[PDB]
Every structure is written in structure tokens, then in C-alpha cells.
Amino acid sequence: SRAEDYEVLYTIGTYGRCQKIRRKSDGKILVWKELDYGSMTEAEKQMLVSEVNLLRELKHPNIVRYYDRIIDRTNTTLYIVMEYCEGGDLASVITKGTKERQYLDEEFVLRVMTQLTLALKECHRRSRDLKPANVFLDGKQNVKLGDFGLFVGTPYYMSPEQMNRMNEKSDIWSLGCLLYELCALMPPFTAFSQKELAGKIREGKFRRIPYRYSDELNEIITRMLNLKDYHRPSVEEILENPLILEHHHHHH
């Protein structure tokens, strides 16, 4: 309700800045996203209101949880309060692995696969970017999909359908790309330009993920990267995989 209900501890990152905060009433650790709407038009503020209502709706263990919205009309600043994910985002995990030359555990990849697949299933059920920067880790081995998604960069994760026209199986391809990058510490198709990239995607060829990962894990990631959307496994078919066990799911 009010900014003064919370105390900022410090800034985590800088669409304004993201800050770790403490709710005064009970000391709960949260974060908020700080947005200056002062320069926005009425139309834009209207679709901002629409977006925020949308986030207040989705509740799921594998989706970053919204708590509150605070309007500071004096500084024309809006705060979106959400849960704190102490393990940060998946992009930093991959970069860390890349820089330090250390692959991630299969167990970790299975957790990401299982929990992101359940996030997707929920998103599809309701009607969000499937990329490492939009994936967050809490302090309990849980994985959460953030709200990014609802030019300069190469569109590494774009499916062959999207690269022409025109589909939930497209999301499966994107997940395949993300899990592939998590394993290999590089995307399955790399290139310097989008046109070069598009040429590679159309061939649909890539390296096997590293041998430290099982044939079973390689197989399902490879299936997700099938050129034909109808050969990619559905969320249901993914979760039926013998690889995926109770402990790979979320725990409170």
C-alpha cells in the first residue's frame, strides 16, 4: 500500500532499478522494481495498469510471485513488490560456468527442465520470455519464470516457425535452446548475424551436449530441437520422462 511500509536495503540491479527490501510489519525479505512513469502518456499508463493487473492474477510455485503495487505520485514512481530469489537469474549461472569453465550438474538441469516445463504448462493453461535472464532461482532449489515478455541482440532461441510463420510447440523449442545452453554453456546455433543464424536453424544441426550428460537427457533436449513442431514433445510428454522425479519439482 505505502512505500513507508518497506525499507530498502540496497540495489540489486538497474526500466528503473531493482532493490532488495524489507517489509516492516514482519521483516520479510522481498524485492521491488522501480518504474518512473512521469514521462508516460495516458494511453501508456493505461496499458501499464493492464499489465500490472495481469501479474496480480498468475499465482504458481514456478512463476515469480507478485505481492504488491505501490504508487508514489509525488516522485511519479511505481513499485512492483515481488518475492526475493536469492540464487539470481539463470543468465548469470551460465556466464559463471562459462567464465570459470565448470559445467552444471545433471541434477540441476533436470530441476530446471521439470520446473520450467510446469511454468510453461501454466502459461498455456491461462490463455513470457523463455530465456536465461527471465529465469530465477530461490534459496530452496526452486526455479521460477519471470515476467520479461509481458533489436541489437541475436535471436538465438527463435524457432523455425517464428522465423517465417507462424504455437505452443514453439515454446518447447525455446526451452530446448535454454536447456541446451545450460548444458553446453553456449546456444545450439551460434552466428554473428541474424541471417547467418537463420541459415543454421534451418539445417537443424548442432553438437551433442557434453558427454558428462546422459544419453537420456541428450535425447529429450534433441527432441525439443526438432525442426518439425509436431515432433517436439508436449509438456505432458516431457514430464512423463523417466528422468523426471518428485525431487526435481518445487518444494516450499
Ligand X SMILES: CCOc1cc(-c2nc(-c3cc(OC)c(OC)c(OC)c3)cnc2N)ccc1C(=O)O
Annotated binding-site ranges for ATP: 12-18, 33
**Which of ligand X, Cl ion, none does 247 bind, CB closer than 5 to 8 A by kind?**
Cl ion
**Contact track, Cl ion, 60-79, x by CB under 5 A:** -x------------------
Among residues 129, 138, 147, 229, the one annotated as catalytic is 129
Cβ nearer to Cl ion, comparing 6 with 213: 213
Cβ nearer to ligand X, comparing 93 with 110: 93
- Is 247 among the residues that bind Cl ion (CB under 5 A)? yes
Can you give the binding site for ligand X, defined by CB under 6 A? 12-13, 18, 31, 33, 64, 82-85, 88-89, 92, 134, 136, 146-148
Distance in Å, CB of 182 to ligand X, minimum? 16
Cβ nearer to ligand X, comparing 147 with 158: 147
- Is 129 among the residues that bind Cl ion (CB under 5 A)? no
**Which of Cl ion, ligand X, none does 85 bind, CB closer than 5 to 8 A by kind?**
ligand X
Strands 135-137 and 88-89: antiparallel
Instruction: Look at the block and give the residue holding cell 529465469.
Output: 135
Cβ nearer to ligand X, comparing 23 with 223: 23
Which of the stretches 27-35, 95-103, 167-175, 187-195 binds Cl ion when contact is defined by CB under 5 A? 95-103
Nearest-10 Cα torsion for 150, 167, 144, 245: 170
Q: Is 129 a catalytic residue?
A: yes
- Is 106 among the residues that bind Cl ion (CB under 5 A)? yes
Cβ nearer to ligand X, comparing 37 with 244: 37
- Is 105 among the residues that bind Cl ion (CB under 5 A)? yes
Cα 137-169-224 angle, rounded to 5 deg: 70
**Which of ligand X, Cl ion, none does 155 bind, CB closer than 5 to 8 A by kind?**
none
- Is 205 among the residues that bind Cl ion (CB under 5 A)? no
Strands 143-145 and 135-137: antiparallel
- Residues designated as active site: 129
Q: Which residues bind Cl ion (CB under 5 A)?
A: 61, 101, 105-106, 142, 210, 247, 250, 252
